[PDB]
Amino acid sequence: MDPQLERQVETIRNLVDSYMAIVNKTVRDLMPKTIMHLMINNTKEFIFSE
């Protein structure tokens, strides 16, 4: 299967790397936004109002 698996393995690996690059961009973006929405702003609301 070496004539096939060699190419199939390389094909899959390149696809995985590209897709994971996209996922890393998305998570880097979401995390600061998620933290601000749920943690910092609620703290400001509590300190002023509660």
From Swiss-Prot:
Signal peptide extent: none
Q: Where in the cell is it found?
A: Cell membrane; Membrane, Clathrin-coated pit; Cytoplasmic vesicle; Presynapse
Record PTM text = Phosphorylated by CDK5 leading to synaptic vesicle endocytosis (SVE) activation.
Q: What is known of its domains?
A: The dynamin-type G mediates homodimerization and plays a role in self-assembly. The C-terminal proline-rich domain (PRD) mediates interaction with SH3-binding partners. Is required for DNM1 self-assembly.
Disease cited in the entry? Developmental and epileptic encephalopathy 31A: An autosomal dominant epileptic encephalopathy, a heterogeneous group of severe early-onset epilepsies characterized by refractory seizures, neurodevelopmental impairment, and poor prognosis. Development is normal prior to seizure onset, after which cognitive and motor delays become apparent. Developmental and epileptic encephalopathy 31B: A form of epileptic encephalopathy, a heterogeneous group of severe early-onset epilepsies characterized by refractory seizures, neurodevelopmental impairment, and poor prognosis. Development is normal prior to seizure onset, after which cognitive and motor delays become apparent. DEE31B is an autosomal recessive form with onset in the first months of life.
Q: How does it assemble?
A: Homodimer; homodimerization is mediated by the dynamin-type G domain which promotes assembly-stimulated GTPase activity. Homo-tetramer formed from two dimers in the absence of lipid. Oligomerizes into a helical polymer that self-assembles around the vesicle membrane, when associated to the menbrane through lipid binding.
Q: What does this protein do?
A: Catalyzes the hydrolysis of GTP and utilizes this energy to mediate vesicle scission and participates in many forms of endocytosis, such as clathrin-mediated endocytosis or synaptic vesicle endocytosis as well as rapid endocytosis (RE). Associates to the membrane, through lipid binding, and self-assembles into rings and stacks of interconnected rings through oligomerization to form a helical polymer around the vesicle membrane leading to constriction of invaginated coated pits around their necks.
Per the record, the similarity remark reads: Belongs to the TRAFAC class dynamin-like GTPase superfamily. Dynamin/Fzo/YdjA family.
What protein name applies here? Dynamin-1
Please name the source species: Homo sapiens
